[PDB]
Amino acid sequence: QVFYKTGDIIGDIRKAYCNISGAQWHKVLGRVANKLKEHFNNKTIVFKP
Amino acid sequence: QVQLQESGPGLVKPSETLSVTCSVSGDSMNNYYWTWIRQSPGKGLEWIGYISDRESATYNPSLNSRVVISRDTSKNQLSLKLNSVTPADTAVYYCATARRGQRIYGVVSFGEFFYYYSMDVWGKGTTVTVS
Amino acid sequence: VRPLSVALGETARISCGRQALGSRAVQWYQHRPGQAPILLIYNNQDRPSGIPERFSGTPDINFGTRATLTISGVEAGDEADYYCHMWDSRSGFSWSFGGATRLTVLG
Ligand SMILES: *[C@@H]1O[C@H](CO)[C@@H](O[C@@H]2O[C@H](CO)[C@@H](O[C@@H]3O[C@H](CO)[C@@H](O[C@@H]4O[C@H](CO)[C@@H](O)[C@H](O)[C@H]4NC(C)=O)[C@H](O)[C@H]3NC(C)=O)[C@H](O)[C@H]2NC(C)=O)[C@H](O)[C@H]1NC(C)=O
Ligand SMILES: *[C@@H]1O[C@H](CO)[C@@H](O[C@@H]2O[C@H](CO)[C@@H](O)[C@H](O)[C@H]2NC(C)=O)[C@H](O)[C@H]1NC(C)=O
Ligand SMILES: *[C@@H]1O[C@H](CO)[C@@H](O)[C@H](O)[C@H]1NC(C)=O
Ligand SMILES: *[C@@H]1O[C@H](CO)[C@@H](O)[C@H](O)[C@H]1NC(C)=O
To answer: Which residues are glycosylated (chain A) (predicted)?
Structure first.
């Protein structure tokens, strides 16, 4: 029975990350906000974490 | 150009305050950071402590601010001052210009970068011996 | 201080005792005892004015390589205590001036 543990890294320590498009996300978010405004009696749509 | 000339007393009484100044011409506070070289005849090379342009004091971590650094910019006699001196920290006080450049290996927002520290001009220094 | 050199006509390829961990950037100086020294090569690729082509240049790509110092055109100046002024990412600040190496020339 073998157990694989995490070993020390070699080189420079770096952090993981995720790159998402600059303006395409805001464009799609605006369209989704418009659809939500249609389906929610024309109110202002607020997103929060 | 950068010209160097010290005005240290040359003699210090034990456990007393020092004021070792260096004369520099042609430049001002902001352009050059000001570090100091520790050296002596037949001795090692070290930074006991040095001042920033904004009068911030950075020292040897093992030293832990044994000395206090203050200086004067109008006279250009930037000063490394020693409090509670000892023969252990007896060294020639080179007045050294310090410049910084940075090597970036990863995302800047994350903080993944470091300065490669350049050492261009070394001071003449002055010799002080504890009585 | 540990000496390391070789007779004339051969390059004394002194390598820094420190091992490069992470990104590297080294500084190289021509020292003088008790006086003001200068710098020769303060980057893996920087070749400032007045520096001939005698120095080997290793670009800092494909991490795993070693920093080695080789010199030619030997004179009286180069016998002084060299200091491999290295900076690396993980080790942080190098309060010491690196491995102090000296060149011994006799004949
Ligand atoms: C996600 O997006 C982020 C930005 O939002 C992006 O981060 C960037 O990533 C690249 C590559 O990973 C970095 O590029 C680095 O740039 C520096 C200098 O510009 C280079 O340093 C030089 O390296 C050479 C040899 O490699 C050396 O000779 C030289 O001395 C070095 N210094 C200088 C001054 O030239 C790095 O080499 C280089 N990285 C690589 C791997 O080549 C950016 O710095 C990062 N940040 C920014 C703001 O652009 C990230 O990559 C994206 N992720 C994906 C998966 O796409
Ligand atoms: C986690 O801690 C252990 C022990 O403190 C480290 O093991 C040491 O590793 C170094 C070289 O990597 C050796 O020189 C030591 O002899 C090891 N110590 C012992 C007690 O074996 C281990 O490297 C540490 N892990 C990380 C990622 O730093
Ligand atoms: C993600 O990768 C694709 C293809 O490699 C590229 O076209 C796109 O620009 C990348 N994303 C970002 C934000 O750069
Ligand atoms: C609210 O917005 C939707 C879509 O933008 C629209 O169809 C609707 O007419 C708006 N409400 C009013 C009262 O005009």
So the answer is: 42
CATH of the domain at C88: 2.60.40.10
Q: Which domains does chain B have, with CATH numbers?
A: 3-130 (2.60.40.10)
Q: Which residues of B touch C (CB under 8 A)?
A: 4, 39, 41, 44-47, 60-61, 92, 94, 103, 105, 114-124
Which residue from B minimizes the CA distance to C26?
Answer: B116
Task: Specify the DSSP element, H or E, that contains A28.
Answer: helix A24-39
Can you give the residue range of the structural domain that contains C84? 2-106
Min Cα–Cα distance to chain C from A16, Å: 17
Instruction: Write down the residue that tokens 């005698």 correspond to.
Output: C54
* Atom 13, ligand 4: residue with shortest CA distance: A42
CB contact under 8 A, B117 and C97: no
- How many structural domains is chain C composed of? 1
At what resolution in Å was this solved?
A: 3.1
**Method of elucidation:** cryo-EM
